[PDB]
Amino acid sequence: VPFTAIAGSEIFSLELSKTEALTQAFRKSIGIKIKEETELIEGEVVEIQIDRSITGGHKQGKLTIKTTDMETIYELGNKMIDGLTKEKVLAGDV
Amino acid sequence: VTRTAAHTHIKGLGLDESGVAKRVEGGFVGQIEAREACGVIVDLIKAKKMSGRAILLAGGPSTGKTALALAISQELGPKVPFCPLVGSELYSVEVKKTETLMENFRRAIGLRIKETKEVYEEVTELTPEENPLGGYGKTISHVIVGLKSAKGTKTLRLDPTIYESIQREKVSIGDVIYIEANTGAVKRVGRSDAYATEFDLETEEYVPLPKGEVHKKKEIVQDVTLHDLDVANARPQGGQDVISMMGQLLKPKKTEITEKLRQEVNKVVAKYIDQGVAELIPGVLFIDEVNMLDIEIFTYLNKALESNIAPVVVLASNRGMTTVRGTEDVISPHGVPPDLIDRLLIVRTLPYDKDEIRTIIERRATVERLQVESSALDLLATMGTETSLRYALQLLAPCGILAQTSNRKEIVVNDVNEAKLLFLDAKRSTKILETSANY
Amino acid sequence: KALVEEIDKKTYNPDIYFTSLDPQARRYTSKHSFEERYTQQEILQSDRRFMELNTENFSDLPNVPTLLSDLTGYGHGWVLKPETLREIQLSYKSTKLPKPKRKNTNRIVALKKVLSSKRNLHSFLDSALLNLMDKNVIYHNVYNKRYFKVLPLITTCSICGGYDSISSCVNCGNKICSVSCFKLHNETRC
Ligand SMILES: Nc1ncnc2c1ncn2[C@@H]1O[C@H](COP(=O)(O)OP(=O)(O)O)[C@@H](O)[C@H]1O
Ligand SMILES: [Zn+2]
Numbered sequence: 001v002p003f004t005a006i007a008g009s010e011i012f013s014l015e016l017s018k019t020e021a022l023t024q025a026f027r028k029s030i031g032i033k034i035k036e037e038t039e040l041i042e043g044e045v046v047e048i049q050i051d052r053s054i055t056g057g058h059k060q061g062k063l064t065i066k067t068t069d070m071e072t073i074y075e076l077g078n079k080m081i082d083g084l085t086k087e088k089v090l091a092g093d094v
Numbered sequence: 095v096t097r098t099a100a101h102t103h104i105k106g107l108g109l110d111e112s113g114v115a116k117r118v119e120g121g122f123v124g125q126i127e128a129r130e131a132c133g134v135i136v137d138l139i140k141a142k143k144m145s146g147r148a149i150l151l152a153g154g155p156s157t158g159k160t161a162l163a164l165a166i167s168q169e170l171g172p173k174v175p176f177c178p179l180v181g182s183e184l185y186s187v188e189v190k191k192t193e194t195l196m197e198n199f200r201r202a203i204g205l206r207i208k209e210t211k212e213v214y215e216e217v218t219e220l221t222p223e224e225n226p227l228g229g230y231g232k233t234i235s236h237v238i239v240g241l242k243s244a245k246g247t248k249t250l251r252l253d254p255t256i257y258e259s260i261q262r263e264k265v266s267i268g269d270v271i272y273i274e275a276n277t278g279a280v281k282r283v284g285r286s287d288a289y290a291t292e293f294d295l296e297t298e299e300y301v302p303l304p305k306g307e308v309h310k311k312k313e314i315v316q317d318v319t320l321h322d323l324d325v326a327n328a329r330p331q332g333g334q335d336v337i338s339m340m341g342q343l344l345k346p347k348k349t350e351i352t353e354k355l356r357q358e359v360n361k362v363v364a365k366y367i368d369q370g371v372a373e374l375i376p377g378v379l380f381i382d383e384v385n386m387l388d389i390e391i392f393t394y395l396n397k398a399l400e401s402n403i404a405p406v407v408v409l410a411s412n413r414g415m416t417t418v419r420g421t422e423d424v425i426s427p428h429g430v431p432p433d434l435i436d437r438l439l440i441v442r443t444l445p446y447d448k449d450e451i452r453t454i455i456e457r458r459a460t461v462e463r464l465q466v467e468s469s470a471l472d473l474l475a476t477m478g479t480e481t482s483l484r485y486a487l488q489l490l491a492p493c494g495i496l497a498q499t500s501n502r503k504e505i506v507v508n509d510v511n512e513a514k515l516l517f518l519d520a521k522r523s524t525k526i527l528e529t530s531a532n533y
Numbered sequence: 534k535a536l537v538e539e540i541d542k543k544t545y546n547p548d549i550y551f552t553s554l555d556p557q558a559r560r561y562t563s564k565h566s567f568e569e570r571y572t573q574q575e576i577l578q579s580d581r582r583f584m585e586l587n588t589e590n591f592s593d594l595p596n597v598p599t600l601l602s603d604l605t606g607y608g609h610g611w612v613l614k615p616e617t618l619r620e621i622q623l624s625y626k627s628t629k630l631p632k633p634k635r636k637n638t639n640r641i642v643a644l645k646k647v648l649s650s651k652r653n654l655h656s657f658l659d660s661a662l663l664n665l666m667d668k669n670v671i672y673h674n675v676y677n678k679r680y681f682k683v684l685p686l687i688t689t690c691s692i693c694g695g696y697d698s699i700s701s702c703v704n705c706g707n708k709i710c711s712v713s714c715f716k717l718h719n720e721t722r723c
C-alpha cells in the first residue's frame with residue numbers, strides 16, 4: 001500500500017499547474033495491481049546453435065535448454081537469436 | 095470490492111409525465127419544487143429544441159446541489175455529453191481562461207457519426223508480374239495476392255500501392271493481413287496458424303486464424319464531439335522523416351483555437367450531416383463554486399450566453415450578499431452581478447428535515463451495507479438536525495468499524511458516542527482553539 | 534541496447550551466435566505435398582505399420598507378407614474347412630430348400646472350380662482371369678495426384694494427449710508434452 005506523504009508547500013511548480021499537481025496527487029493516491037500470465041523457458045541451455053535460413057525450414061536453430069529435472073532441446077524461430085545476445089552473453093544462461 | 099462515496103445511492107429524480115414526484119425514490123427525498131423544475135428543464139433539454147439556457151439556484155452546503163447535478167446528468171443517459179468541472183479550474187496556465195471556456199462549450203455539444211467500411215484478409219498464393227510504354231525502366235502495377243481467411247478464399251489484385259503495403263507489412267505467404275480497401279494499406283492481424291510451428295519457439299504471436307469470409311464488410315457508429323476533431327487536426331498524424339518523430343516526441347501544449355477553424359469544422363460537419371452521416375445533440379454544462387469567478391468572466395458571459403451553439407448551462411452559487419472576486423463595489427446576491435442575473439432565473443434549494451434526514455442516514459446505512467439501530471439512528475439524525483447531517487454521514491463508517499471491532503453488526507449508542515469522543519466536529523472546535531498557547 | 538558498448542567486431546552476425554561451456558567443444562554447422570517432403574523408406578515403414586493395423590489378431594498377424602505383396606504388386610487357410618463347409622449342410626437344419634436347379638454347362642462347372650478355388654487377389658495378379666490394365670484401373674483409380682495437405686498438422690502427444698507445455702526429446706525427436714512421459718520416452722521411445 002504505497003502512500004503519498006508530501007507537505008503542501010511544494011504544490012507550486014514551474015512545470016505542473018495547481019490543478020495538474022492536485023490531480024496527479026489524487027490519481028497517485030489510488031493504485032492498481034496488474035496480474036499478467038507471462039511464461040518462461042528455464043534450464044541450462046548448454047549450446048546455442050543458429051543454422052541458416054533454409055527454404056524448407058526457415059530456422060533450424062538448435063538450443064539445448066534443460067533444467068536439473070530433465071534434458072531437453074529446443075528450436076529458435078528466426079526471431080530470438082539476437083534476443084539472447086542483445087547484450088553479449090554466452091550459452092548456458094538461464 | 096466496492097466504493098460508495100456520498101453517492102451511488104441516487105439513480106434518478108423519480109418523476110412521471112404529470113410532474114408528480116415520489117417522496118422516497120431514486121435516492122431523493124423531499125424537494126417537490128426543485129424536482130419539478132429539474133424535470134421540466136430536462137424535458138426541455140431532451141427535445142434538442144434550444145441552446146444557451148441558464149439557471150441559478152440558491153443552495154447552501156449539503157442542501158443537495160451536487161446530488162441534483164448528478165441525477166440530472168444521469169437523466170439524459172451516458173451518451174449525452176456532460177463536463178461539470180470545478181470553478182477553480184478555469185484559471186489555467188498555458189491558455190487564457192476565456193479560451194478554455196470556449197473549449198468547454200465546444201466539448202459540450204455532441205454528435206453521432208458513422209462510416210461503413212470493407213476489408214480483406216492468410217494468403218493462399220502469390221503471383222507478381224504493365225509496360226513503361228516509353229523511356230521508363232518498367233511499370234509494375236498489378237500482383238495477384240492470396241487471401242485465405244476461414245470461410246472461403248478469394249484472391250484478388252488491386253492498385254500496386256496495396257502491393258507495396260504488403261511489403262510494408264512484411265508478411266510471408268503464410269501470414270494473415272487485414273486490409274481495409276478504403277485506403278489500400280495494411281492492418282496486421284499477425285502471423286498464421288496453418289504455416290506455423292516452423293520452429294519450437296516464436297516471439298512473434300502465432301495469432302488465431304481469421305474467422306469468416308474474406309470480403310468482410312461492416313458499419314461503425316461513433317459519438318464524437320468536435321474538440322477531439324480540432325485537437326486531432328492540430329497535430330500531425332503520420333510522417334516518416336525527422337520532423338514527424340521529433341514532433342511526436344515533443345510534448346504538445348494547450349493553445350488558442352482560432353475562429354476560422356470553428357467555421358471550417360462547422361462547414362464540414364454540416365456537409366456530413368446533410369448526407370445522413372451524423373445526427374445532432376446539444377450538451378449540458380455545469381460549474382460549481384461560481385462566486386469565486388472574477389467580474390471579467392461574469393460580464394463576458396453576458397455576451398457568451400448569446401452564442402447560437404452554446405448548450406444549456408447551469409449556474410450554482412451558494413453565498414449571499416457578496417462582492418464578485420476582484421470587485422471593489424460590485425456586491426450582489428450569491429456573488430453574481432445583476433447585469434448577469436438579468437439573463438436567467440432563480441431556484442431555491444433548501445436543507446432537509448427530521449424524517450428526511452433520518453431516512454437519508456438509514457439509506458446511507460443500506461448502501462454501506464450496515465445495520466442501524468433505532469436509538470443510534472435517532473441520535474445521529476437529531477444531532478444532524480441541530481448542527482449537520484454530514485457529521486452523522488462521516489460517523490456512520492467509523493461506527494461500523496467500531497461495531498466490527500466489537501464483533502457486532504449494528505451501531506449502538508456506545509459506538510456513536512465513542513466516535514463522537516474520538517472525532518470532534520466544527521462546533522466543538524469553535525470554542526476550544528482560543529485557549530492554545532502554542533498555535 | 535547499451536549504446537556504443539564494448540564490441541571488437543567478433544562475429545556479431547545477427548543470425549550467428551554459438552557459445553557453450555565446452556562439454557563437446559564444437560560450433561554451428563557450415564561448409565505442400567508429403568511426396569515432396571520426406572523419402573520413401575519411412576513412408577514404406579508407416580504403410581507396413583498400417584497394414585499390421587489391418588491385421589486384427591493371430592488370424593491375420595502373419596498375413597503381412599500377403600498384404601505387402603498385394604499392395605506392392607487353420608487360421609488363414611481359406612474358408613473351406615469341413616468344420617465350416619462340410620458341416621453347414623446340417624447347420625441350416627431349421628429349414629432350407631437346397632435343390633439342384635441347373636443344367637450341365639461350363640458355367641455349372643465354374644460354380645465348383647471357382648467355389649473352392651483357393652484363389653486370392655494375389656493369384657488374380659498371377660492369373661489371366663483378368664487382364665493387366667484391370668488391376669491398374671483398380672489400383673490407380675483410387676490414389677490421388679498432388680493434394681496432400683490443405684489444413685495444418687496437429688502433432689499430438691505420443692503417449693498422453695496434452696496440448697500445451699510440449700517439448701521434444703534431445704535425440705529421438707518425438708513429440709511429447711509432460712516431462713512425466715519422458716521417463717518412458719527415454720526408455721521405450723528414444
Ligand atoms: N434530498 C436528498 N436526499 C438524499 N440525499 C441527499 C439529499 N440532499 C443531499 N443528499 C446527500 O448529501 C450529500 C452531500 O450533499 P452536498 O453535495 O454537500 O449538497 P450541496 O451540493 O447542496 O452542498 C450528498 O452525497 C447527497 O447524497
Ligand atoms: Zn505424453
Ligand SMILES: [Zn+2]
Pocket residue numbers: 702703704705706707718719722723
Ligand atoms: Zn527421446
